[PDB]
UniProtKB/Swiss-Prot annotation, chains A, B, C, D, E, F, G, H, I, J:
Residues of the whole record sequence present: 623 to 695 of 758
Site (Not glycated): K6, K12, K16, K26, K35, K38, K65, K70
Organism: Homo sapiens (Human)
Post-translational modification: Phosphorylation at serine and threonine residues in S-P or T-P motifs by proline-directed protein kinases (PDPK1, CDK1, CDK5, GSK3, MAPK) (only 2-3 sites per protein in interphase, seven-fold increase in mitosis, and in the form associated with paired helical filaments (PHF-tau)), and at serine residues in K-X-G-S motifs by MAP/microtubule affinity-regulating kinase (MARK1, MARK2, MARK3 or MARK4), causing detachment from microtubules, and their disassembly. Phosphorylation decreases with age.
Entry coiled-coil feature ranges: none
Name the record gives this protein: Microtubule-associated protein tau
Omega-N-methylarginine carried by residues: R44
């Protein structure tokens, strides 16, 4: 049994920008009300209950490269 | 049994920007009310209850490269 | 049984920026009220209850490279 | 049984920036009220209850490189 | 049984910046009230209850490199 | 010329109440922006510009009685 | 010329109340921005610009009685 | 010319109350920004600019009685 | 010319109260910024600029009675 | 010319109260910034700039009675 694993990755990811601008984020405020009794969370549980998270995200260009290599016997 | 694992990664990730701008984040405030009785959280549990987290994130360009190599016998 | 593990990573991650700008973060304040009785948290539990964390994050460019190498017998 | 583990990492991470700017963080204050009875926290538990932590984080560029190498028999 | 562990890391992390700027952090004060009865914390527990920690963090560039090497028999 | 002015008003205005009840006023916050250049206000002029004044008014019963008696030549 | 002015007003204004109840006023905060250049206010002029004054007014019953008696030649 | 001015006002204004109750005033904070250049206020002029004055007014019953008696030639 | 001015006002203003109750005033703090250049205030002018004066006023019942008697030639 | 001015006012203003109750005033602190250049205030001018004066006023009942008697030729 001979296994040869030799993938090759030379692929570039490029982002270029002159300038972005005048970005304005101006939301009004709201209101949230939550009524519950019991919560039971088990094994890898994520949650957000009752929130007003306004988010401004302005990365000056960006990229994601996700890569997985897996061998199972 | 011969196993050869030799992947190669030479892929660059690049981000270039002149200038970003005049970014304004001006939200009004809100209100959140949460009523509960019992919480039971087990094994890798994350939560946010009752919050107003306004976030401004302006990285001057950015990148993420995620890589996994796994072999199981 | 011969196992050879020799992956190679020469991939650069680059971020370049002239200047960022005039970033303004001006939220109004809000109000949060939380009413509960009992919390029971076990084994790797993270939580935020009742908070107003406004966050300004302006890294002058940035990158993340995450890498894992695992072999199990 | 012959196991050879020799991964190689020569991948640089670089961040360059001229200047950042005039960053202003000016939130209004809010109010938080939390009412509870009993908390029971066991084994690796982190929490924040009742807080207004405004955070300004302006690193002059930055990077994270996370790396794990694991072998289990 | 022959095990050879010889990973190599020559990957530099670099951050360069001309100047940062005129960073202003000016929050209004708020108010937090917490009412509870009993807390029971066991084995690696961290918490913050009732706080207003405004934080300004301006590192003149920075990096984190985290590395783990583990072998278990 | 004989002028006799003798009105006689012996009326009553009455308000009777057992109890009111629980009153809750919980608005979210908004945002107002006003842009102007030149204003000119003269002779008995009243004005309000840019206002978020929430008002809760709970008089425990009440009345207004207004009377004008005017005689002229 | 005989002028007789003799109005007789013996009225009553009455307010009676057992009790009011619990009153709660909990608004979120907002934000107001006003931009102007030149103002000109003359002769009996009243004004308010840029205001977030929340008012809670709970008189334990109340009344207003206004009377004007004017006679002129 | 015979002028007789003899109004007789023996009215009553009354307020009676058992008790009021619990009153809570809990607003969040806001933010106000005012930009102007030249102001000009003359002759009996009243003004307020840039105000967050929250007012709680709880008189234990109250009344206003206003009377004007004017006679002129 | 015979002028007789003899008004007779023997009215009463009364306020009676058992008790008020618990009063709570708990506002969050805000922020006010005012930018101006030249001001000009003349002849009976009253003004307030940049104010966060919270006022709690709890008179144990109260009244105002205002009277004007004016006679002119 | 016979002028007789003899008004007779024997009114009463009364306030009666058992007890008030517990009064709590707990505001958060704010922040005020005022920028100006040239001011000019003349002839009966009253002003307040940049003020955080919280006021708690609890008179144990109270009244104001204001009277003006004016006669002129």
């Amino acid at each position: 049994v001979q296994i040869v694993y030799k993938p090759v990755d030379l692929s570039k990811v490029t982002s270029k920008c002159g300038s972005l601008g005048n970005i304005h984020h101006k939301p009004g405020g709201g209101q949230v009300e939550v009524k519950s009794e019991k919560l039971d969370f088990k094994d890898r549980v994520q949650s957000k209950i009752g929130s007003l998270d306004n988010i401004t995200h302005v990365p000056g260009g960006g990229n994601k490269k996700i890569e997985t290599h897996k061998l199972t016997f």
